[PDB]
């Protein structure tokens, strides 16, 4: 029962949202800006763990006003298996056959972490390449540094050196740390907005957190999906096993 | 030995299972509940027929049965009050019920009643059995709760209604007659206790107003009925408990908190963790499925762990504690409901949804994370275990419309045809919903529903009720609700619902992508069906 | 008392510390994945714990089995019977090719080879009444193992009520995740060396001699357990070692060879204890790689090579091929060393060590495609979430092979022939020929021959012994056919039952006769279960040997002089195997069908059978 302590902790995780910090630099109208609806952030943290990483894809689309303002519309939460400092994510979901999905782009992923950095780390780069290397290269990464008190958002692109390096690393160990570069990643323009509201898409089975089911986690699984309200990380459904002891 | 023994020892063998039989061979029976229905009926009937000389009883015999004996002995008069969290003396009515067994009226010339107790008590039980313990009113102790219920029934608006009401109480008839006992100030001034009545009513009302069960203006003298007081009356909840539910229940209230809030109820004020049971209790508190923030010193931890146990039907050794737990389930139901009622009124989507399960969980004596084949009383014990361990989604089993197919998933042939029949008896809905903007601010929602189960009277009763909510995109804000009662004439055929909801200003300026519309069985696990309600192309006028 | 002593003993083993966490996880999950050290208990004790936690809260269960090899099935069945104080046919029982000792129906636990449970999946495409399989030695990537995954993943998506288990001591955690893990900490340690110059020709008999002198200068009492690739390098290395000892030097050492083809008593001598100062120096193949507990072994070695069997689809050519082992084989070998005391391993591992290079775990997928399409796992094979299927190339060979066999229709969906064949624990070519042998009314001789072209070698050949003895060749009598030597041997064996003595007197390998028997009666019983007419009935030896041409059906030969050959797949030049009946003569019909084509230092053709021009021309 390491989790019991974490599970109790996650109840107050809503208080971290009185302190929301977004990484900013000089606005460049030559490159994109990603708009993340504030409600999605609030929820995504509310369902996250304090220690273990939690991740989702983001889908959105450009407005007419500016083709370079990509509004994020939907966060797709998918079967996955979290760890401290890394997360194993299933493949890009097929959501084509859902309603209102007319002309969404897959813009990238978004995830929690417990180490504040100014650059994409090595598990990030491994996973970012795993997911997007051969599929869609411009996919950003929105990294959320979540810690007692606050959350701090940070958006990155990955360079091709990054991708290549990530392709080389099928696996990542605690100690190996071979060939890594902080310059692999570049600041991407993120704006949090409260004037658009986005929504969730969750697996049809409803469970996204295969920690306590790590045998059944299919990392190339062809899964089904629906619009819906995502479960919390230590939600009873993510823990069939604990109700067996009792 | 010749007459009885063959007639006894025939009968002694046949239905007797436990250690009861080695007692019955000796002509003495035992009789309690939680004993085989045939086994206790033998006891009654052998004792009735002269063959047992001695039946040893728990108190139920005294209310349940008509089984007299010449002699009745109360061994001991110590009883455990779980309510009071403590050992106590037999109440007078229990002793008088027990003694009503003494003496067979048709046969016996007379009857004998023996009480056995500490000398301290003897004087007391003397008075009880000899017409000298007076009947006196306790109406003040429950005055606040009972006043509120008439306020809620709308028979009280001004506090003169209250002092009239009190005149039809026993308290009142009894106060007039022994004002010193009831601590009246001065009957001669007060006459028929008009100022006393008014004063009780006042103090009562103020503590009610303090807790938001009522609205009160002393100066004006208007009594008014809150929605919260209206729950307290309807679900028979202690005012203090409504207070705790008021402060503690939150938009961000969580499963782990609910168990705590539940355990905070006035109903469980006296629950204490006694020294001996503490070792066993710690064993359960660390295998607890929902985290307990509270210590094992704390009483709240006990009530919490006990309730979690009832949901898992845990076997308990200690008698003390097993009585305690029983006390909890018989209240758990209507407390958890009162909690649910508040959250639904207040709009909090997520705790409302969770409370509804706890309510289910306390009816069905099982947790959410269990396939409801276990919910059909009429399923075998092995078959579900194979459907739980596998991990195939619950709903997944439901989709198959072929009786052979369902049997292949089970991996049993004959259980596969009977479970197909059960499956078709599991409640399910179809929901469609479009929306129509009436004005800019006002949206009408038009819903069409089909109920898809085949009715069985043993399995569904007269009706199966269904909560319908329309909730915001976050899934945190209940925007409309209504309860649908499905009945055997309703299943299979389509119907329509319409309602309006007034969009908040935020959403008026930028429509959200969607809302949600959800139907949940009040009774049947994992029969929830929700659909998104798009606003995709929409122009608000 | 003896059973309460067995309990006490069980409760000291490392896996007992986890037994409740384990039992919960299984009960709660379709799937599992035990991981735990070599000797930890995983075998013996997991299926005990499952049976027990039915039997001790009023329930019953079933179960099935632990691992891949015949000797493991039988041996750890006999163990677990002793750890119950029961005879084998109560709650024990095994099932292997040619040997079965059934359990009661109900409680009871069912210890089998992989291939046998695949055959039983014909009578249950659901594998039901079986609560709880188990998993044994999953990291032995055999085609049967990998087939029975595909079928079990699909079954568990049908029938959640079922329970799996997985289990090894050496296994990729990441790979398992891709395809609840439970780690069992605790054993003895095994100190591991790596040779330190290119191990390039890996019976560097110099490396071998010098290592055995070093591990005799350390005065550490224990037995050595070399691992070698086949009977050739076992007999050369052992013989060479003996020669060196006479030249360099029994009353200090006994060499003992261990291969599936040696007499069953010689096999049992590996586990026996040698006189006083005599060190025992096993030279074994991969049959000693997994499960076993040769008490006395302190000191492995490991030449890092195995004996693979290597199809090519486009030309239809099989071949034996000495190949680098995989990291999993290396780990299992080393695990033989620290089960009963601290040990060493001596990985002769440098070149194709490159240990990094050494593949973690290479096999034709056709059998596993049939299981993916007979459990209805039905997207397609190449969107099965394997692990592997690895290469796309080998996937499309298997789909094309099933298509041409008429196991698959125009839509990629199974035919009735394909469904039946997916239920037989054979090659599907051999399953096709079996159905032709059930029409004809020749099923029982075809069943013997199909089982025999899926089993260990049948004759015993002493050490360097360049050929059969002329008694064994006069088990073919007239007809130049390995397949009929092995029938005449099997007929006669089935009568004797004084049968260790019969085997000895005719130089035959007792546990290949028993395995072949068991395989034959399983394939017959699965036939009958799938609603078929058997019999045998007339000049069937001719119709039967003909049918062999369609069960091994690119494997046709010529004869172009003494011990020289000529594969009728465009003219390539091969040798009759030195074990064959037909290992020398002029004979009568110059066309042979064979069971294997085996790369060595030449290509060689294995179990042969002469077949007339009409037999080759119309099957």
Q: So, the CATH homologous superfamily of the largest domain in chain B?
A: Sec63 N-terminal domain-like domain
Look at the structure and give the CATH class of the largest domain in chain B: Mainly Alpha
> What summary fits the major beta sheet of chain B?
4 strands, antiparallel
Largest interface: A-B, 33 and 36 residues
Tell me which oligomeric state these chains represent.
Answer: part of a larger assembly
Under the CATH scheme, which architecture of the largest domain in chain B would be assigned?
A: Orthogonal Bundle
Class from secondary-structure proportions of chain A: alpha/beta
Radius of gyration of chain B equals: 30 Å
Q: For the terminal residues of chain B, how far apart are their CA atoms?
A: 98 Å
Number of strands of chain A: 13
Strand content of chain A: 25-35%
Report the total helices of chain A. 5
Name the helix and strand elements of chain A from N-terminus to C-terminus, one letter apiece: HEEHEEEEEHEEHEEEEH
Strand order of the largest sheet of chain B: 12-11-14-15
Number of domains of chain B: 4
Main location (chain C): nucleus
Binding site for ATP (chain C): 36-43
Organism (chain C): Saccharomyces cerevisiae (strain ATCC 204508 / S288c)
Protein name (chain C): Pre-mRNA-splicing factor ATP-dependent RNA helicase PRP16
How would you describe this structure to a colleague?
This is part of a larger assembly, with chains A (246 residues), B (541 residues) and C (619 residues). Chain A has 246 residues and is α/β, with parallel strands linked by helices. Chain A has helices at residues 2-9, 38-46, 122-132, 160-168, 242-245, and strands spanning 20-22, 33-37, 55-62, 69-77, 80-83, 86-89, 105-113, 140-147, 150-158, 185-187, 189-193, 199-203, 225-227. Chain A has 5 helices and 13 strands. In chain A, helix 3 (122-132) packs across helix 4. Chain A is globular and about 60 Å long. Chain A starts with a helix and ends with a helix. In chain B, 43% of the residues lie in helices and 17% in strands. Chain B has a 4-stranded antiparallel sheet, with no helix packed on it. Chain B has a 3-stranded antiparallel sheet with strand order 9-10-13, with no helix packed on it. In chain B, a hairpin with a 6-residue loop joins strand 14 and strand 15. In chain B, helix 12 runs antiparallel to helix 17 (319-346). The termini of chain B are far apart. Chain C is an alpha/beta fold and 619 residues long. Chain C folds into 4 domains: 1-186, Rossmann fold, CATH 3.40.50.300; 187-362, P-loop containing nucleotide triphosphate hydrolases (Rossmann fold, 3-Layer(aba) Sandwich), CATH 3.40.50; 363-425, no CATH class; 426-619, no CATH class. The chains are: A alpha/beta (246), B alpha+beta (541), C alpha/beta (619). Chains in contact: A-B, A-C, B-C. The A-B interface holds A 1, 4, 7-8, 11, 14, 39, 42-43, 73-74, 99-100, 195-199, 204-205, 213, 216, 227-229, 236-237, 239-240, 242-243, 245-246 and B 252, 254-257, 286-291, 293, 308-309, 311-312, 314, 367-370, 388, 391, 393, 473-475, 510, 512-514, 516, 530, 532, 534, 536.
């Amino acid at each position: 029962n390491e989790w019991r302590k974490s599970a109790i902790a996650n109840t107050l995780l809503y208080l971290r949202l009185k302190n929301i910090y977004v990484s900013a630099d000089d606005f460049v109208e030559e490159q994109n800006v990603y708009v993340l609806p504030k409600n999605l952030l609030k929820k995504f943290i509310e369902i996250s763990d304090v220690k273990i990483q939690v991740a989702a894809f983001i889908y959105g689309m450009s407005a007419k006003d500016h083709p370079k303002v990509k509004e994020i519309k939907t966060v797709v939460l998918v079967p996955q298996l979290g760890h401290v400092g890394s997360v194993q994510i299933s493949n890009i979901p097929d959501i084509g056959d859902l309603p209102d999905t007319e002309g969404l782009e897959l813009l990238g992923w978004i995830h929690t972490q417990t180490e504040e950095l100014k650059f994409m780390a090595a598990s990030e780069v491994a996973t970012h390449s795993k997911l997007f290397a051969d599929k869609k290269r411009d996919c950003i990464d929105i990294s959320i540094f979540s810690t007692p008190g606050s959350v701090s958002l940070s958006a990155y692109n990955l360079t091709d050196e990054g991708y290549q390096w990530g392709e080389e690393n099928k696996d990542i160990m605690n100690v190996l740390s071979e060939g890594f570069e902080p310059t692999f990643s570049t600041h991407a323009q993120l704006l949090l907005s409260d004037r658009i509201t986005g929504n969730f898409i969750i697996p049809s089975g409803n469970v996204w957190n295969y920690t306590f089911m790590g045998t059944a986690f299919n990392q190339e699984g062809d899964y089904n999906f629906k619009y819906g309200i995502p479960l919390e990380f230590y939600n009873e459904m993510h823990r069939p096993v604990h109700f067996l002891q009792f | 030995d010749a007459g009885s023994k063959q007639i006894l020892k025939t009968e002694a063998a046949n239905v007797l299972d436990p250690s009861l039989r080695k007692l019955i061979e000796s002509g003495i029976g035992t009789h309690h509940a939680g004993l085989t229905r045939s086994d206790r009926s033998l006891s009654e009937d052998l004792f009735a027929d002269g063959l047992l000389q001695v039946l040893v009883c728990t108190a139920t015999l005294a209310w349940g049965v008509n089984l007299p004996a010449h002699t009745v002995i109360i061994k001991g008069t110590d009883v455990y009050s779980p309510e009071k969290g403590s050992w106590e003396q037999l109440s007078p009515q229990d002793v008088l019920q027990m003694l009503g067994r003494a003496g067979r009226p048709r046969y016996d010339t007379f009857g004998e009643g023996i009480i056995i107790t500490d000398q301290s008590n003897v004087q007391y039980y003397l008075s009880v059995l000899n017409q000298q313990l007076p009947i006196e009113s306790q109406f003040v102790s429950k005055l606040v709760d009972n006043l509120n219920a008439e306020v809620v029934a709308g028979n009280i608006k001004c506090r003169n209604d209250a002092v009239n009401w009190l005149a039809y109480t026993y308290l009142y008839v009894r106060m007039l007659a022994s004002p010193m006992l009831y601590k009246v100030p001065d009957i001669s001034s007060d006459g028929q206790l008009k100022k006393f009545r008014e004063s009780l009513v006042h103090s009562a009302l103020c503590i009610l107003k303090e807790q938001e069960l009522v609205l009160y203006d002393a100066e004006n003298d208007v009594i008014e009925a809150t929605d919260l007081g209206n729950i307290a009356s309807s679900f028979y909840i202690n005012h203090a408990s409504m207070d705790v539910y008021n402060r503690e229940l939150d938009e961000h209230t969580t499963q782990i908190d609910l168990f705590r809030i539940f355990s905070m109820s006035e109903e469980f004020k006296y629950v204490s963790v006694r020294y001996e049971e503490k070792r066993e209790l710690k064993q359960l508190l660390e295998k607890a499925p929902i985290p307990i923030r509270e210590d094992i010193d704390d009483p709240l931890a006990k009530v919490n762990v006990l309730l979690q146990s009832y949901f898992s039907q845990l076997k308990f050794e200690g008698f003390a504690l097993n009585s305690d737990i029983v006390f909890i389930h018989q209240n758990a139901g209507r407390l958890l409901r009162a909690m649910f009622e508040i959250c639904l009124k207040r709009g909090w989507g997520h705790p409302t949804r969770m409370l509804l399960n706890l309510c289910k969980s306390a009816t069905t004596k099982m947790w959410p994370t269990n396939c409801p084949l276990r919910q059909f009383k009429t399923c075998p014990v092995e078959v579900i275990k194979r459907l739980e361990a596998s991990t195939v989604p619950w709903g997944d089993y439901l989709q198959l419309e072929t009786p052979a197919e369902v049997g292949r998933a089970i991996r049993s042939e004959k259980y596969g045809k009977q479970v197909y029949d059960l499956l078709k008896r599991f409640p399910k809905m179809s929901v469609t919903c479009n929306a129509q903007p009436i004005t800019r601010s006002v949206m009408r929602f038009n819903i069409e529903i089909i109920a898809d189960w085949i009715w069985d009277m043993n399995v569904h009763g007269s009706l199966e009720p269904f909560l319908l909510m329309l909730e915001d995109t976050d899934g945190d804000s209940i925007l409309y609700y209504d309860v649908l009662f499905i009945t055997p004439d309703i299943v299979g055929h389509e119907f329509t619902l319409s309602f309006t909801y007034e969009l908040k200003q935020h959403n008026q300026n930028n429509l959200p992508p969607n809302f949600f519309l959800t139907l949940i069985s009040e009774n049947w696990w994992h029969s929830e069906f929700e659909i998104p309600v798009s606003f995709n192309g929409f122009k608000l006028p | 008392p003896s059973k309460d002593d067995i309990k006490h003993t069980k409760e000291q083993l490392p896996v007992f510390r986890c037994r409740s966490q384990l039992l919960s996880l299984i009960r709660e999950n379709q799937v599992v994945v035990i991981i735990g050290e070599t000797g930890s208990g995983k075998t013996t004790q997991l299926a005990q714990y499952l049976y027990e936690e039915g039997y001790a809260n009023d329930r019953g269960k079933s179960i099935v089995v632990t691992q891949p090899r015949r000797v493991a099935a039988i041996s750890v069945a006999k163990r677990v019977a002793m750890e119950m104080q029961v005879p084998l046919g109560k709650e024990v029982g095994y099932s292997i090719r040619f040997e079965d000792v059934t359990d009661s129906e109900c409680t009871k636990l069912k210890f089998v080879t992989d291939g046998i449970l695949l055959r039983e999946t014909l009578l249950d495409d659901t594998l039901d009444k079986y609560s709880c399989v188990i998993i044994d030695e999953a990291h032995e990537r055999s085609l049967n193992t990998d087939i029975l995954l595909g079928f079990f993943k699909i079954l568990l998506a049908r029938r959640r009520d079922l329970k799996l288990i997985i289990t090894s001591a050496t296994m990729n955690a990441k790979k398992f995740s891709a395809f609840p893990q439970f780690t069992i900490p605790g054993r003895f340690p095994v100190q591991t060396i790596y040779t330190s110059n290119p191990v390039q020709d890996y019976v560097e008999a110099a490396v071998s001699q010098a290592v055995k002198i070093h591990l005799a200068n350390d005065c550490s009492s224990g037995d050595i357990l070399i691992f070698m690739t086949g009977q050739e390098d076992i007999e050369t290395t052992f013989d060479t070692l003996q020669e060196k000892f006479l030249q360099v030097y029994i009353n200090d050492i006994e060499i003992l060879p261990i291969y599936s083809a040696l007499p069953a008593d010689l096999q049992f001598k590996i586990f026996q204890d040698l006189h006083g100062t005599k060190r025992k120096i096993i030279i074994a193949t991969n049959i000693a790689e997994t499960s076993l507990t040769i008490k006395g072994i302190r000191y492995v070695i490991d030449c890092g090579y195995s004996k693979l069997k290597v199809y090519n689809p486009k030309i239809g050519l099989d071949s034996l091929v000495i190949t680098p082992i995989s990291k999993a084989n290396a780990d299992q070998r080393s695990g033989r060393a620290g089960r009963t005391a601290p040990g060493t391993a001596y990985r002769l591992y440098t070149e194709d060590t490159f240990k990094e290079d050494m593949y973690l775990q290479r096999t034709n997928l056709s059998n596993t495609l049939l299981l993916l399409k007979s459990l209805d796992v039905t997207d397609e094979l190449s969107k099965f979430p394997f692990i592997d299927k690895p290469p796309l190339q080998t996937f499309l060979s298997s789909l094309y092979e099933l298509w041409f066999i008429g196991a698959i229709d125009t839509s990629g969906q199974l035919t009735p022939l394909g469904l039946q064949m997916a239920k037989f624990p054979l090659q599907p070519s051999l399953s096709k020929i079996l159905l032709i042998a059930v029409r004809n009314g020749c099923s029982d001789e075809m069943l013997t021959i199909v089982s025999m072209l899926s089993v260990p070698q049948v004759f015993y050949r002493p050490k360097e012994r360049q050929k059969e003895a002329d008694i064994a060749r006069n088990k073919f009598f007239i007809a130049k056919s390995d397949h009929l030597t092995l029938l005449n041997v099997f007929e006669q064996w089935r009568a004797n039952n004084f049968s260790s003595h019969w085997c000895n007197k005719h130089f035959v390998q007792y546990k290949s006769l028993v395995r072949a028997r068991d395989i034959r009666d399983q394939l017959l019983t699965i036939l009958k279960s799938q609603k078929i007419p058997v019999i045998s009935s007339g000049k069937d030896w001719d119709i039967i040997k003909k049918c062999i041409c369609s069960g091994f059906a690119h494997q046709a030969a010529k004869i172009t002089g003494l011990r020289n050959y000529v594969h009728l797949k465009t003219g390539v030049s091969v040798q009759l195997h030195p074990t064959s009946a037909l290992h020398g003569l002029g004979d009568l019909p110059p066309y042979v069908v064979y069971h294997e084509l085996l790369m060595t230092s030449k290509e060689y053709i294995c179990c042969v059978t002469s077949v007339d021009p009409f037999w080759l021309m119309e099957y």
